[PDB]
UniProtKB/Swiss-Prot annotation:
Its EC number is 1.18.1.2. It comes from Spinacia oleracea. It is a peripheral membrane protein. Transmembrane segments: none annotated. Residues 17-139 form the FAD-binding FR-type domain. It catalyses: 2 reduced [2Fe-2S]-[ferredoxin] + NADP(+) + H(+) = 2 oxidized [2Fe-2S]-[ferredoxin] + NADPH. It is found in: Plastid, Chloroplast stroma; Plastid, Chloroplast thylakoid membrane. The chain holds residues 74 to 369 of 369 of the full protein. The gene is PETH. This is Ferredoxin--NADP reductase, chloroplastic. Keywords: Chloroplast, Electron transport, FAD, Flavoprotein, Membrane, NADP, Oxidoreductase, Photosynthesis, Plastid, Thylakoid, Transit peptide, Transport.
Length: 296
Protein backbone atom coordinates (compact mmCIF):
# COMPACT_ATOMS: atom_id res chain seq x y z
CA UNK A 1 0.00 0.00 0.00
CA UNK A 2 1.57 3.30 -0.94
CA UNK A 3 0.79 6.83 -0.09
CA UNK A 4 2.80 7.94 -3.11
CA UNK A 5 2.14 7.84 -6.83
CA UNK A 6 4.00 4.60 -7.49
CA UNK A 7 1.48 2.71 -9.64
CA UNK A 8 2.66 2.06 -13.16
CA UNK A 9 6.00 3.86 -12.83
CA UNK A 10 8.86 3.08 -15.18
CA UNK A 11 12.33 2.32 -13.90
CA UNK A 12 15.49 1.72 -15.89
CA UNK A 13 13.85 1.41 -19.28
CA UNK A 14 17.25 2.67 -20.47
CA UNK A 15 20.48 1.39 -18.93
CA UNK A 16 24.18 2.34 -19.02
CA UNK A 17 24.89 -0.38 -21.59
CA UNK A 18 21.99 0.77 -23.71
CA UNK A 19 21.24 4.46 -23.12
CA UNK A 20 18.73 6.59 -24.93
CA UNK A 21 20.41 9.25 -27.07
CA UNK A 22 18.52 12.52 -26.83
CA UNK A 23 19.39 15.91 -28.28
CA UNK A 24 19.85 19.24 -26.59
CA UNK A 25 17.09 21.76 -27.45
CA UNK A 26 18.04 24.62 -25.10
CA UNK A 27 20.75 25.40 -22.57
CA UNK A 28 20.36 28.63 -20.60
CA UNK A 29 22.43 30.05 -17.70
CA UNK A 30 19.88 30.82 -15.03
CA UNK A 31 22.04 32.48 -12.35
CA UNK A 32 23.33 36.03 -12.50
CA UNK A 33 27.03 36.91 -12.76
CA UNK A 34 27.11 37.79 -9.06
CA UNK A 35 26.27 34.16 -8.17
CA UNK A 36 29.04 31.96 -6.72
CA UNK A 37 28.98 29.39 -9.48
CA UNK A 38 26.75 28.93 -12.49
CA UNK A 39 23.58 26.96 -12.77
CA UNK A 40 22.06 26.05 -16.12
CA UNK A 41 18.59 24.87 -17.12
CA UNK A 42 18.78 22.60 -20.12
CA UNK A 43 16.04 20.87 -22.10
CA UNK A 44 16.56 17.61 -24.00
CA UNK A 45 14.34 15.88 -26.53
CA UNK A 46 13.35 12.32 -25.77
CA UNK A 47 10.42 11.89 -28.15
CA UNK A 48 8.28 10.32 -25.42
CA UNK A 49 10.71 7.41 -25.05
CA UNK A 50 11.41 8.20 -21.38
CA UNK A 51 8.10 7.90 -19.51
CA UNK A 52 9.14 9.55 -16.23
CA UNK A 53 7.04 10.75 -13.31
CA UNK A 54 7.57 13.91 -11.15
CA UNK A 55 10.28 13.31 -8.49
CA UNK A 56 12.28 10.81 -10.54
CA UNK A 57 15.86 11.21 -11.88
CA UNK A 58 17.73 10.35 -15.09
CA UNK A 59 21.37 9.27 -15.37
CA UNK A 60 23.67 11.06 -17.80
CA UNK A 61 26.78 9.37 -19.25
CA UNK A 62 29.15 12.16 -20.21
CA UNK A 63 31.15 11.75 -23.45
CA UNK A 64 34.71 10.44 -23.27
CA UNK A 65 36.51 7.66 -21.36
CA UNK A 66 37.98 7.47 -17.89
CA UNK A 67 41.69 7.09 -17.28
CA UNK A 68 41.31 3.37 -18.14
CA UNK A 69 39.74 3.91 -21.55
CA UNK A 70 36.32 2.81 -20.29
CA UNK A 71 33.21 5.01 -20.59
CA UNK A 72 32.50 7.40 -17.73
CA UNK A 73 30.27 6.42 -14.85
CA UNK A 74 26.78 7.81 -15.02
CA UNK A 75 25.81 10.79 -12.82
CA UNK A 76 22.17 11.16 -11.61
CA UNK A 77 20.15 14.38 -11.95
CA UNK A 78 16.67 14.98 -10.55
CA UNK A 79 14.28 15.88 -13.38
CA UNK A 80 13.36 19.59 -13.15
CA UNK A 81 10.37 19.36 -15.49
CA UNK A 82 6.99 17.79 -14.82
CA UNK A 83 5.98 14.64 -16.77
CA UNK A 84 4.46 16.73 -19.61
CA UNK A 85 7.49 18.97 -19.69
CA UNK A 86 8.30 22.64 -20.27
CA UNK A 87 6.42 22.43 -23.57
CA UNK A 88 3.45 20.42 -22.39
CA UNK A 89 3.82 17.60 -24.87
CA UNK A 90 5.58 14.84 -22.85
CA UNK A 91 8.45 14.81 -25.33
CA UNK A 92 11.19 16.84 -23.60
CA UNK A 93 13.00 16.52 -20.20
CA UNK A 94 14.73 19.32 -18.27
CA UNK A 95 17.69 19.43 -15.91
CA UNK A 96 18.98 22.07 -13.47
CA UNK A 97 22.78 21.69 -13.33
CA UNK A 98 25.41 23.53 -11.31
CA UNK A 99 28.82 23.71 -12.99
CA UNK A 100 31.30 22.04 -10.57
CA UNK A 101 34.80 23.61 -10.37
CA UNK A 102 37.27 22.95 -7.54
CA UNK A 103 41.02 22.90 -6.88
CA UNK A 104 43.01 19.77 -6.18
CA UNK A 105 45.86 19.32 -3.70
CA UNK A 106 48.45 20.91 -6.02
CA UNK A 107 46.34 24.05 -6.33
CA UNK A 108 45.27 23.04 -9.86
CA UNK A 109 41.75 23.83 -11.06
CA UNK A 110 39.64 20.78 -11.70
CA UNK A 111 36.28 20.90 -13.48
CA UNK A 112 33.79 18.16 -12.59
CA UNK A 113 33.31 15.80 -15.57
CA UNK A 114 29.55 15.53 -16.05
CA UNK A 115 28.51 18.98 -14.83
CA UNK A 116 30.88 20.73 -17.24
CA UNK A 117 29.99 18.47 -20.17
CA UNK A 118 26.33 19.25 -19.54
CA UNK A 119 26.68 23.01 -18.98
CA UNK A 120 28.75 23.28 -22.14
CA UNK A 121 26.16 21.53 -24.36
CA UNK A 122 24.93 23.39 -27.43
CA UNK A 123 21.48 22.99 -29.05
CA UNK A 124 21.72 19.94 -31.35
CA UNK A 125 24.33 18.09 -29.31
CA UNK A 126 23.49 14.47 -28.45
CA UNK A 127 23.39 13.15 -24.88
CA UNK A 128 23.19 9.64 -23.47
CA UNK A 129 20.45 9.22 -20.88
CA UNK A 130 19.47 6.35 -18.58
CA UNK A 131 16.52 5.79 -16.26
CA UNK A 132 14.01 6.87 -15.10
CA UNK A 133 15.38 6.15 -11.62
CA UNK A 134 13.71 6.46 -8.22
CA UNK A 135 10.66 6.09 -5.97
CA UNK A 136 11.75 8.13 -2.94
CA UNK A 137 10.72 11.56 -4.19
CA UNK A 138 7.38 10.68 -5.82
CA UNK A 139 4.34 12.85 -5.02
CA UNK A 140 1.66 11.83 -2.54
CA UNK A 141 -1.48 10.29 -4.07
CA UNK A 142 -3.68 12.58 -1.91
CA UNK A 143 -4.70 15.74 -3.89
CA UNK A 144 -5.58 17.50 -0.65
CA UNK A 145 -2.22 16.79 1.06
CA UNK A 146 -0.10 19.41 2.80
CA UNK A 147 3.23 19.25 0.97
CA UNK A 148 6.25 20.92 2.53
CA UNK A 149 9.29 21.19 0.29
CA UNK A 150 12.76 22.28 1.51
CA UNK A 151 15.44 22.60 -1.15
CA UNK A 152 18.92 24.09 -1.39
CA UNK A 153 20.41 25.09 -4.74
CA UNK A 154 19.81 22.44 -7.42
CA UNK A 155 17.71 20.63 -4.86
CA UNK A 156 14.94 22.84 -6.26
CA UNK A 157 14.67 20.50 -9.29
CA UNK A 158 12.12 17.88 -8.09
CA UNK A 159 9.92 20.60 -6.58
CA UNK A 160 9.75 22.53 -9.84
CA UNK A 161 8.54 19.23 -11.31
CA UNK A 162 5.86 18.83 -8.59
CA UNK A 163 4.74 22.45 -8.85
CA UNK A 164 4.40 22.56 -12.61
CA UNK A 165 2.03 19.60 -12.33
CA UNK A 166 0.10 21.15 -9.45
CA UNK A 167 -0.23 24.73 -10.65
CA UNK A 168 0.69 25.05 -14.37
CA UNK A 169 -1.26 22.07 -15.80
CA UNK A 170 -4.83 20.79 -16.19
CA UNK A 171 -5.15 17.06 -15.51
CA UNK A 172 -8.13 14.80 -16.00
CA UNK A 173 -7.61 12.85 -12.77
CA UNK A 174 -5.63 15.24 -10.60
CA UNK A 175 -6.47 18.61 -9.17
CA UNK A 176 -4.38 19.82 -6.27
CA UNK A 177 -6.40 21.39 -3.50
CA UNK A 178 -4.15 21.17 -0.44
CA UNK A 179 -1.37 23.44 0.74
CA UNK A 180 2.08 23.38 -0.85
CA UNK A 181 4.85 25.27 0.95
CA UNK A 182 8.23 25.81 -0.64
CA UNK A 183 11.36 26.93 1.20
CA UNK A 184 14.37 27.63 -1.09
CA UNK A 185 17.77 28.42 0.46
CA UNK A 186 20.44 29.95 -1.84
CA UNK A 187 23.58 32.07 -1.10
CA UNK A 188 22.75 35.13 -3.19
CA UNK A 189 19.74 36.73 -4.87
CA UNK A 190 21.49 36.12 -8.19
CA UNK A 191 21.35 32.42 -7.21
CA UNK A 192 17.56 32.26 -6.75
CA UNK A 193 16.39 29.59 -9.22
CA UNK A 194 13.00 29.81 -11.01
CA UNK A 195 11.77 32.60 -8.68
CA UNK A 196 9.76 34.14 -11.51
CA UNK A 197 7.80 30.89 -12.10
CA UNK A 198 7.08 30.50 -8.39
CA UNK A 199 5.92 34.12 -8.19
CA UNK A 200 3.39 33.44 -10.99
CA UNK A 201 2.21 30.28 -9.21
CA UNK A 202 1.73 32.24 -6.01
CA UNK A 203 -0.53 34.75 -7.72
CA UNK A 204 -2.49 31.90 -9.29
CA UNK A 205 -3.14 29.87 -6.12
CA UNK A 206 -2.61 32.30 -3.22
CA UNK A 207 -4.44 30.04 -0.75
CA UNK A 208 -2.82 26.80 -1.89
CA UNK A 209 0.79 27.95 -2.22
CA UNK A 210 3.18 29.46 0.37
CA UNK A 211 6.66 30.63 -0.61
CA UNK A 212 9.80 31.45 1.42
CA UNK A 213 13.34 32.19 0.27
CA UNK A 214 16.52 32.13 2.37
CA UNK A 215 19.43 34.07 0.85
CA UNK A 216 22.19 33.27 3.40
CA UNK A 217 24.79 35.87 2.48
CA UNK A 218 22.24 38.70 2.27
CA UNK A 219 19.72 38.08 5.04
CA UNK A 220 20.00 37.64 8.81
CA UNK A 221 17.54 36.86 11.62
CA UNK A 222 17.13 39.00 14.82
CA UNK A 223 20.24 37.64 16.61
CA UNK A 224 21.98 38.54 13.38
CA UNK A 225 22.44 34.96 12.17
CA UNK A 226 22.81 34.11 8.48
CA UNK A 227 19.52 33.25 6.79
CA UNK A 228 20.10 29.59 6.06
CA UNK A 229 17.13 27.37 5.21
CA UNK A 230 16.74 26.10 8.81
CA UNK A 231 17.17 29.74 9.99
CA UNK A 232 14.16 30.72 7.89
CA UNK A 233 12.21 27.57 8.97
CA UNK A 234 12.67 28.23 12.71
CA UNK A 235 10.68 31.39 12.13
CA UNK A 236 7.69 29.08 11.41
CA UNK A 237 8.68 26.38 13.89
CA UNK A 238 5.48 26.24 15.87
CA UNK A 239 3.43 26.06 12.64
CA UNK A 240 5.56 23.40 10.91
CA UNK A 241 5.81 21.20 13.99
CA UNK A 242 2.04 21.41 14.27
CA UNK A 243 1.81 20.45 10.58
CA UNK A 244 4.07 17.40 11.06
CA UNK A 245 1.63 16.07 13.60
CA UNK A 246 -1.04 15.54 10.98
CA UNK A 247 -1.43 12.39 8.91
CA UNK A 248 -1.90 14.24 5.60
CA UNK A 249 1.35 16.19 5.82
CA UNK A 250 4.29 15.12 3.68
CA UNK A 251 7.82 16.47 4.04
CA UNK A 252 10.35 16.39 1.17
CA UNK A 253 13.96 17.60 1.43
CA UNK A 254 16.39 17.84 -1.46
CA UNK A 255 19.76 19.41 -2.04
CA UNK A 256 23.20 19.46 -0.47
CA UNK A 257 23.93 16.72 2.11
CA UNK A 258 24.64 19.40 4.66
CA UNK A 259 21.07 20.69 4.98
CA UNK A 260 19.95 17.50 6.69
CA UNK A 261 21.92 18.24 9.92
CA UNK A 262 20.75 21.82 10.47
CA UNK A 263 17.10 20.80 10.11
CA UNK A 264 17.49 17.87 12.48
CA UNK A 265 18.98 20.24 15.08
CA UNK A 266 15.93 22.54 14.89
CA UNK A 267 13.60 19.51 15.13
CA UNK A 268 15.29 17.73 18.08
CA UNK A 269 14.58 20.79 20.19
CA UNK A 270 10.95 21.19 19.15
CA UNK A 271 10.19 17.56 19.82
CA UNK A 272 12.01 17.34 23.16
CA UNK A 273 10.01 20.36 24.34
CA UNK A 274 6.96 18.15 24.01
CA UNK A 275 8.46 15.01 25.45
CA UNK A 276 9.18 13.42 22.06
CA UNK A 277 12.39 11.69 20.94
CA UNK A 278 12.97 13.11 17.43
CA UNK A 279 14.99 10.13 16.33
CA UNK A 280 12.07 7.76 16.93
CA UNK A 281 9.54 10.24 15.68
CA UNK A 282 11.49 10.78 12.44
CA UNK A 283 11.72 7.00 12.12
CA UNK A 284 7.94 6.68 12.33
CA UNK A 285 7.54 9.51 9.84
CA UNK A 286 9.90 7.83 7.37
CA UNK A 287 7.96 4.55 7.68
CA UNK A 288 4.67 6.38 7.06
CA UNK A 289 6.21 8.01 3.92
CA UNK A 290 5.91 11.48 5.38
CA UNK A 291 9.62 12.30 5.70
CA UNK A 292 11.30 12.06 2.30
CA UNK A 293 14.93 12.91 1.81
CA UNK A 294 17.30 13.04 -1.18
CA UNK A 295 20.61 14.85 -0.45
CA UNK A 296 23.88 14.68 -2.31
C1 LIG B 1 19.97 11.55 -6.75
C2 LIG B 1 20.87 12.62 -7.19
C3 LIG B 1 20.33 13.75 -7.85
C4 LIG B 1 21.14 14.78 -8.22
N1 LIG B 1 20.56 15.85 -8.76
C5 LIG B 1 21.36 16.83 -9.21
C6 LIG B 1 20.78 17.97 -9.89
O1 LIG B 1 19.58 18.08 -10.12
N2 LIG B 1 21.65 18.95 -10.29
C7 LIG B 1 23.05 18.88 -10.00
O2 LIG B 1 23.77 19.83 -10.30
N3 LIG B 1 23.58 17.81 -9.40
C8 LIG B 1 22.79 16.79 -9.03
N4 LIG B 1 23.36 15.72 -8.49
C9 LIG B 1 24.85 15.66 -8.42
C10 LIG B 1 25.37 15.11 -9.75
O3 LIG B 1 24.97 13.78 -9.84
C11 LIG B 1 26.92 15.20 -9.87
O4 LIG B 1 27.51 14.58 -8.72
C12 LIG B 1 27.41 16.61 -9.97
O5 LIG B 1 26.88 17.23 -11.15
C13 LIG B 1 28.95 16.64 -10.03
O6 LIG B 1 29.40 15.59 -10.95
P1 LIG B 1 30.59 15.80 -11.97
O7 LIG B 1 30.62 14.61 -12.88
O8 LIG B 1 30.48 17.12 -12.55
O9 LIG B 1 31.84 15.75 -11.01
P2 LIG B 1 32.99 14.66 -10.80
O10 LIG B 1 33.93 14.73 -11.92
O11 LIG B 1 32.39 13.37 -10.45
O12 LIG B 1 33.67 15.18 -9.60
C14 LIG B 1 33.12 14.98 -8.26
C15 LIG B 1 34.21 14.79 -7.36
O13 LIG B 1 34.83 16.05 -7.11
C16 LIG B 1 35.31 16.09 -5.77
N5 LIG B 1 35.05 17.40 -5.18
C17 LIG B 1 33.88 18.17 -5.19
N6 LIG B 1 34.04 19.31 -4.58
C18 LIG B 1 35.34 19.37 -4.15
C19 LIG B 1 36.09 20.33 -3.43
N7 LIG B 1 35.59 21.53 -3.03
N8 LIG B 1 37.38 20.03 -3.15
C20 LIG B 1 37.88 18.85 -3.57
N9 LIG B 1 37.28 17.86 -4.23
C21 LIG B 1 35.98 18.17 -4.52
C22 LIG B 1 34.59 15.01 -5.00
O14 LIG B 1 35.57 14.10 -4.45
C23 LIG B 1 33.74 14.27 -6.03
O15 LIG B 1 33.99 12.84 -5.96
C24 LIG B 1 22.58 14.69 -8.03
C25 LIG B 1 23.14 13.57 -7.39
C26 LIG B 1 22.30 12.53 -6.95
C27 LIG B 1 22.88 11.33 -6.24
Amino acid sequence: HSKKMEEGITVNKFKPKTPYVGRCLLNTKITGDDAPGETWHMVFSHEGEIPYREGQSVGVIPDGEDKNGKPHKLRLYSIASSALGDFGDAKSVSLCVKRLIYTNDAGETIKGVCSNFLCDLKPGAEVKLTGPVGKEMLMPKDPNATIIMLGTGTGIAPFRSFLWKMFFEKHDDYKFNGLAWLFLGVPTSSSLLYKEEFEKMKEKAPDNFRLDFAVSREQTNEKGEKMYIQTRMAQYAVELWEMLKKDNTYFYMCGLKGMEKGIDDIMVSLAAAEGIDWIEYKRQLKKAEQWNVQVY
